[PDB]
Amino acid sequence: MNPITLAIIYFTIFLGPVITMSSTNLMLMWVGLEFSLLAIIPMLINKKNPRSTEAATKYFVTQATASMIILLAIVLNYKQLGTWMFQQQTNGLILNMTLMALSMKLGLAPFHFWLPEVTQGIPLHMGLILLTWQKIAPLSILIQIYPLLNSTIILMLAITSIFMGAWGGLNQTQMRKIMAYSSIAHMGWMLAILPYNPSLTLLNLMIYIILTAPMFMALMLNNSMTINSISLLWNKTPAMLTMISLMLLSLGGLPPLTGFLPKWIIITELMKNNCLIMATLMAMMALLNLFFYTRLIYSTSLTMFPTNNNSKMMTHQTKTKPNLMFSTLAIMSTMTLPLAPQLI
Amino acid sequence: MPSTFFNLTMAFSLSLLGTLMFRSHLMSTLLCLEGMVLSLFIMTSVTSLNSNSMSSMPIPITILVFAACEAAVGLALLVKVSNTYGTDYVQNLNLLQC
Amino acid sequence: MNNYIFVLSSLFLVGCLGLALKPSPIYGGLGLIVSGFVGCLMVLGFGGSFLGLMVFLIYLGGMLVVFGYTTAMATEEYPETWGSNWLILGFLVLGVIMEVFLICVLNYYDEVGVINLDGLGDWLMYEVDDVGVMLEGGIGVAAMYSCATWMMVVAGWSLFAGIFIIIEITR
Amino acid sequence: ARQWQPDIEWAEQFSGAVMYPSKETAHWKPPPWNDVDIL
Amino acid sequence: LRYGLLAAILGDKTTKKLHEYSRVITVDGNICSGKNKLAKEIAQQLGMKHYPEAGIQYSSTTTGDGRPLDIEFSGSCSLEKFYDDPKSNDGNSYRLQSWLYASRLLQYADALEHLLSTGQGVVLERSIYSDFVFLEAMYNQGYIRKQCVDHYNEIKRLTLPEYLPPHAVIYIDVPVPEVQSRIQKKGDPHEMKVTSAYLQDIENAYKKTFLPKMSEMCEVLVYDSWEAEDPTKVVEDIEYLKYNKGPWLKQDDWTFHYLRMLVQDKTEVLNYTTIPVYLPEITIGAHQGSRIYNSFRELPGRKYAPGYNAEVGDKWIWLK
Amino acid sequence: MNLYTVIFINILLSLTLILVAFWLPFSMKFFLVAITFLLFDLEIALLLPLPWAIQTIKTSTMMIMAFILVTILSLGLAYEWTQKGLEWTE
Amino acid sequence: FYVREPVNAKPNWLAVGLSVGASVFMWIYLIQTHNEDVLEYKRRNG
Amino acid sequence: VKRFFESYHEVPDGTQCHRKTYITTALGGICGIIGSAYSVSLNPADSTLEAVARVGRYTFTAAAIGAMFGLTTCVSAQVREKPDDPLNYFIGGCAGGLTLGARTHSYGTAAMGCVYMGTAAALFKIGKLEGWELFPTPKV
Amino acid sequence: LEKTIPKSTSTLHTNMTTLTTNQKGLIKLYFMSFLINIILIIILYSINL
Amino acid sequence: MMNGRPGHEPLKFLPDEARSLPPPKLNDPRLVYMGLLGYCTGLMDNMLRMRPVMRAGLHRQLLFVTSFVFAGYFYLKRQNYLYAVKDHDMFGYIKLHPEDFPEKEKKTYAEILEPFHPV
Ligand SMILES: CCCCCCCCCCCCCCCCCC(=O)OC[C@H](COP(=O)(O)OCCN)OC(=O)CCCCCCCCCCCCCCCCC
Numbered sequence A: 001m002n003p004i005t006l007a008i009i010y011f012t013i014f015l016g017p018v019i020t021m022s023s024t025n026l027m028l029m030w031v032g033l034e035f036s037l038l039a040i041i042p043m044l045i046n047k048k049n050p051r052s053t054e055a056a057t058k059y060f061v062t063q064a065t066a067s068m069i070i071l072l073a074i075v076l077n078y079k080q081l082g083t084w085m086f087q088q089q090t091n092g093l094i095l096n097m098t099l100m101a102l103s104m105k106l107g108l109a110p111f112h113f114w115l116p117e118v119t120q121g122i123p124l125h126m127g128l129i130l131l132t133w134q135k136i137a138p139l140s141i142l143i144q145i146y147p148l149l150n151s152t153i154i155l156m157l158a159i160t161s162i163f164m165g166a167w168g169g170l171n172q173t174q175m176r177k178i179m180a181y182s183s184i185a186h187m188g189w190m191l192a193i194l195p196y197n198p199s200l201t202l203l204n205l206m207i208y209i210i211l212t213a214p215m216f217m218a219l220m221l222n223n224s225m226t227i228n229s230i231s232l233l234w235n236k237t238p239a240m241l242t243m244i245s246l247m248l249l250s251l252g253g254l255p256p257l258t259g260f261l262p263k264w265i266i267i268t269e270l271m272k273n274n275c276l277i278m279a280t281l282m283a284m285m286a287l288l289n290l291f292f293y294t295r296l297i298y299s300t301s302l303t304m305f306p307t308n309n310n311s312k313m314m315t316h317q318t319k320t321k322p323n324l325m326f327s328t329l330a331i332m333s334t335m336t337l338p339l340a341p342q343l344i
Numbered sequence B: 001m002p003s004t005f006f007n008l009t010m011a012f013s014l015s016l017l018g019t020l021m022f023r024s025h026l027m028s029t030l031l032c033l034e035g036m037v038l039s040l041f042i043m044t045s046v047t048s049l050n051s052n053s054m055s056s057m058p059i060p061i062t063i064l065v066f067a068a069c070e071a072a073v074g075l076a077l078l079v080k081v082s083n084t085y086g087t088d089y090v091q092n093l094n095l096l097q098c
Numbered sequence C: 001m002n003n004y005i006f007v008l009s010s011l012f013l014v015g016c017l018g019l020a021l022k023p024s025p026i027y028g029g030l031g032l033i034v035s036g037f038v039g040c041l042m043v044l045g046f047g048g049s050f051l052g053l054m055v056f057l058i059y060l061g062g063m064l065v066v067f068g069y070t071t072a073m074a075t076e077e078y079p080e081t082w083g084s085n086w087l088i089l090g091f092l093v094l095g096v097i098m099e100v101f102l103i104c105v106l107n108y109y110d111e112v113g114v115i116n117l118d119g120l121g122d123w124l125m126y127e128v129d130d131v132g133v134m135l136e137g138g139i140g141v142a143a144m145y146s147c148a149t150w151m152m153v154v155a156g157w158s159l160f161a162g163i164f165i166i167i168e169i170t171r
Numbered sequence D: 001a002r003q004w005q006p007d008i009e010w011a012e013q014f015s016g017a018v019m020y021p022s023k024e025t026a027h028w029k030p031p032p033w034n035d036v037d038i039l
Numbered sequence E: 001l002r003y004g005l006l007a008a009i010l011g012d013k014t015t016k017k018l019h020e021y022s023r024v025i026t027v028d029g030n031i032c033s034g035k036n037k038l039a040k041e042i043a044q045q046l047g048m049k050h051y052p053e054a055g056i057q058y059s060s061t062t063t064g065d066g067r068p069l070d071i072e073f074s075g076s077c078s079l080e081k082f083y084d085d086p087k088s089n090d091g092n093s094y095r096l097q098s099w100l101y102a103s104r105l106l107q108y109a110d111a112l113e114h115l116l117s118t119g120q121g122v123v124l125e126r127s128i129y130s131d132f133v134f135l136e137a138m139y140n141q142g143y144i145r146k147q148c149v150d151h152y153n154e155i156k157r158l159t160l161p162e163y164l165p166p167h168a169v170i171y172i173d174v175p176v177p178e179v180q181s182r183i184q185k186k187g188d189p190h191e192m193k194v195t196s197a198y199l200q201d202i203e204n205a206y207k208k209t210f211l212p213k214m215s216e217m218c219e220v221l222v223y224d225s226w227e228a229e230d231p232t233k234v235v236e237d238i239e240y241l242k243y244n245k246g247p248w249l250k251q252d253d254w255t256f257h258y259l260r261m262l263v264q265d266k267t268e269v270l271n272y273t274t275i276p277v278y279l280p281e282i283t284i285g286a287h288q289g290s291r292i293y294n295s296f297r298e299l300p301g302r303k304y305a306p307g308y309n310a311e312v313g314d315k316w317i318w319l320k
Numbered sequence F: 001m002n003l004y005t006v007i008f009i010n011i012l013l014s015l016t017l018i019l020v021a022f023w024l025p026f027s028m029k030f031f032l033v034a035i036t037f038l039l040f041d042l043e044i045a046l047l048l049p050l051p052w053a054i055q056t057i058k059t060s061t062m063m064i065m066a067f068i069l070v071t072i073l074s075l076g077l078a079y080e081w082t083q084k085g086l087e088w089t090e
Numbered sequence G: 001f002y003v004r005e006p007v008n009a010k011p012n013w014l015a016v017g018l019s020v021g022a023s024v025f026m027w028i029y030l031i032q033t034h035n036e037d038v039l040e041y042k043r044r045n046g
Numbered sequence H: 001v002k003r004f005f006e007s008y009h010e011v012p013d014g015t016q017c018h019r020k021t022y023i024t025t026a027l028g029g030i031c032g033i034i035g036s037a038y039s040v041s042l043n044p045a046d047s048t049l050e051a052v053a054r055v056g057r058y059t060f061t062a063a064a065i066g067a068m069f070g071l072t073t074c075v076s077a078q079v080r081e082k083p084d085d086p087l088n089y090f091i092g093g094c095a096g097g098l099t100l101g102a103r104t105h106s107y108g109t110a111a112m113g114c115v116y117m118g119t120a121a122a123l124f125k126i127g128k129l130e131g132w133e134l135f136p137t138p139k140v
Numbered sequence I: 001l002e003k004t005i006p007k008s009t010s011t012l013h014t015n016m017t018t019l020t021t022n023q024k025g026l027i028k029l030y031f032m033s034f035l036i037n038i039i040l041i042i043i044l045y046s047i048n049l
Numbered sequence J: 001m002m003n004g005r006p007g008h009e010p011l012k013f014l015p016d017e018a019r020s021l022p023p024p025k026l027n028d029p030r031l032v033y034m035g036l037l038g039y040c041t042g043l044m045d046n047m048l049r050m051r052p053v054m055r056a057g058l059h060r061q062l063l064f065v066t067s068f069v070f071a072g073y074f075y076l077k078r079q080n081y082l083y084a085v086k087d088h089d090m091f092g093y094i095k096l097h098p099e100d101f102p103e104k105e106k107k108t109y110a111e112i113l114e115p116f117h118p119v
């Protein structure tokens, strides 16, 4: 891949969500989504192996069906009201079809089965984008219509997502599938709080992004796509444990760490709205995410696993990978609770 | 108008049903997707012509362009799948389950 | 001729049904071609000369063509599909009859609602300027060049970048 | 004595495709280390 | 500035430097054949560079102050002990084979980056494409287990295909009795305990797998001892050599760039040698590993990064 | 009604002739070609409304946009050219 | 004494200068902004 | 039309036992139909006969769960004049878990379901009485 | 006091984990499930209304 | 929520309606904490690049601290403006709707009989 191709594809990847967020016309939003899809597929398939091809095929089919359903919703609203924007008068079925489509675009349960497979078949720098930058346009389209949504189906989707994310991460031994299920869970939290306050959806979005980017960078440091491969980190690069552990605990949502605040304030709002039963279920089932993050903190930072020999030569060699953003984002994501009133 | 729109929506629903129900091929899914595209194109053009809103005619053109691009990339992916396995079958994409 | 557009929409329905049922990637192409022909015909019935002829010249002449092309060059017909083809043809018959009964029940349940069979030939054209020039569809599709240049740049960029995308996917 | 550290027996339980293989339909095997399947 | 997309866009490209003799050649053979002499002479007569055979201390010599390190810091294996007592319950055999494959791979990379940044061709001794003969020999003799062999083959599959093969492969053929005589004459109390069965397994591996596998993508040149030692014949054969049938023609500036990045990053080279397959022959315990690593970092010039060790004469550590 | 009559007549005539007839006694190059043709046919779709666009007042704008279309199409062609997409030498 | 004389053998004086200048300018602009905002606040409130 | 499931809460517990059991049985049957559809689409079977047998298994099981729960609740409220007592729903949930354990042949599942469903039904009744809302609308 | 609280928690969650992660990468099955979801949502809406 | 209100300028960090609030002081604990975070980011960068922590990259550490304090000052101004606007609107609504915010009839403990609960 040459510079011109790289520039065009990445400019499209960047432009998609920007059009989606800067356009008032649902047609232009749909355009942005299509841009994102078109420009993401090639990067997934770069390696040209069976797994990457399969992941690309699955992604394409799912996202294309979703886009078609969204465009049907738009066309129906157009026949109904003459305008190209959802108002307070659209048949709720239109908006529920739209929500189903956006949920399949994001990766929410029970529309999630494609996300772990794709992320696994895909490399690291691509999972990073797929799980951080490709959540911003479909969430924006929802933030624009939060007053006219169905709390019932939203909460069902969110709680299903929490549950399935926990019960997947409990079993997966692969970094990328673990990240996929964590994404599912946090997006469930977002959807849950959406129709009551979207500022908190955006808060949790930025928190999850700041928490995910540096984790994928940590992994890419040694291309450790597995638990038994990341356990050798104590001999390969032990100056990263003090931060991997803290970022994983923050993801889990442990009180003294940034990652807590999202759950805390979202539960607060749900209580103000009398969604206490759902808030309780979610808060109790996030502890499994915390569990299978602690199980990794163990194998990485609190106990040394059987190492290898050529790791000696790996020690001999130097390295210049981890740019400043790693430290910056990890600190901002682990030590920023005293500033919660501002982030709110 | 009501009748033709009802039938167009039923047709879109049938093509979505076809997509969500695979029958061992992949072309037979891309074709259902294109049928959906066609139904939406027709509904949009028909609403434009019914309302006499000439400020909304570019919309079919745009969606046709983008559906064409989607179909092109889908056909390329199908071509790679065939080049590797030998068939546009869906039981051969059983990887990533581990 | 009151039944004209209704017949056209019903043929479109049957074509999309023969798509939903998946005989093969080639008879599916033929079904798509028929459905598109009928779609153009109904657009012209509603007055979309440019839209319908563009469908003709681009969707069929450009899209279904490469569909069949890629199909022939990258697909093989297996002998099993013939018995199942007959089976799904019977399935299609059953679906047609089920749809007829569906339409009957919907007329019984909503006279002036879902479909006004009594007012079939009506409610096709609601209004039109009788003494008016400059009200075709090209006048609108050509707005793009003066107003709505944003759509034109969007589409041109999609097509532009598709070149790089496809060369990188195939390579 | 000294601190006990994991052994092969303790580390090879994180080496299967999935943990908790109480299933009998889980005939799977670990994926490759470079994502290039064998052929 | 470091090599990357920006350098390649600005003009630090490759095809501007691939003059004839911008090749990579191997001089393989059995153990006591004239490889060093012939390769030095070829390098001189063709203007190319010489990369001697890579052993247990290649990395220790190429990194840091250049001096060697204790075997526990580089390898924990011994060819002397391999020749004295094979079949040992320790693991020296495979723990040596793996480290030597790793060192040969690091050397192949150190040569490829040199060849791609500078058109100066390179000449090497036995490479990652032939290291496996000394493994098949041990397996057929009983010094190693099929599990070790499969581990080796897996690492080979993960590493080798991401690298370009050699242009010319010179095989100096020599028989096992002459080899034993040459050993006795040269003189080594350990090499002189080796077996003609092992030597013949090496020769058979060579002739039956290496030659066929490599004649299909690189020009082979098989010679005996007496055609060797008259090198000008070999050098003129090389100069006349035709260079088709290889992937080196399918390569453009950007494939060369994305290969130069790999070859320049000396950790994505060994990520796959460092996989956690738990063989009792290489599986080091946590206490031993921690002790060795902390002592390695205690050593000088190794505690911090290169330009940050004042105890070796590094100043300005407060502004870099 | 007239178009319908004419096309029906032609179809009838063809089928009648073909009845009397019986009753008297993988390379990616072609795919890339198809894709290029798609990307140019859609350009034709975006280019056809010029006979109606050149009747407007915003001539300085139609000039611009049509030139943009043609120029970037030519650039995409040139790139597909440089990258050996119009060669056929397998 | 190394054998692969690295990129970090000596400092990047351009980076040093730019960093120091950016820091000093940040602090100067910050002080000026703070003082101006205080003056505006007190002008508006008496 | 969704009033089949609202006729359950138009009278105190201890009355209309028959239709209340019918309602809980319909709920069980629906839940089982959905579970069986999911387990048949994902993790399918070999023969459509075995598939429909899976469906019947799950549906009849859930229907028995609901029937036993409703009947035990209303019978407890009958034998003891306490229509506003979550202990009746706890007993009904334990009976449902008992039936689940009888079907699946596992004392573990039996007792686990007992406790879990008992708490669930008791909390359901507590919500019904106090005024808890599930899926409420925004008010902030 | 082990069999009841912690061992039961572990058993329950491991079993549900196996259930939900017994998935094979079959797009047909994933899409049939998506269709069941669509049907259930349409039904919820058309029923409650 | 508060986006669609009258006198709402789009995509502006700090309007002039905010220049009337008292500005934060550089000694503010939150700015000091952001400086601490900058210093720790520098130290962590060194610790990850295998350099001497606290004896390398003084320009880098200074840049970190300066940038953190710089961003903090402005972000803090903005958040103070937002909270002030919130209070403003709330009190305005309270004053324009006296019919839904009535003063409680607060009694004295000599009148209201609270129940007693032994032990
Ligand atoms: C005040 C209010 C309280 C609020 C709540 C606070 C939350 C609790 C704070 C938790 C902070 C630490 C949590 C993460 C634990 C990290 C585990 C760890 O790093 O130790 C293991 C590892 C040992 O490495 P090993 O190979 O055994 O030998 C030493 C060689 N470094 O160690 C390492 O290798 C580290 C990398 C070596 C780098 C060189 C040494 C420089 C120092 C790095 C460690 C800095 C730790 C700072 C601790 C501050 C604690 C507040």
Ligand SMILES: Nc1ncnc2c1ncn2[C@@H]1O[C@H](COP(=O)(O)OP(=O)(O)OP(=O)(O)O)[C@@H](O)[C@H]1O
Binding pocket: E030, E031, E032, E033, E034, E035, E036, E037, E053, E079, E097, E100, E131, E134, E191
């Ligand atoms: N992979 C390996 N496994 C076991 N032994 C090896 C391996 N690679 C090299 N050796 C040992 O290294 C020794 C190489 O000695 P060699 O005779 O090659 O010296 P030399 O300097 O190359 O001289 P010449 O080039 O004339 O042979 C042999 O004894 C051989 O057994």
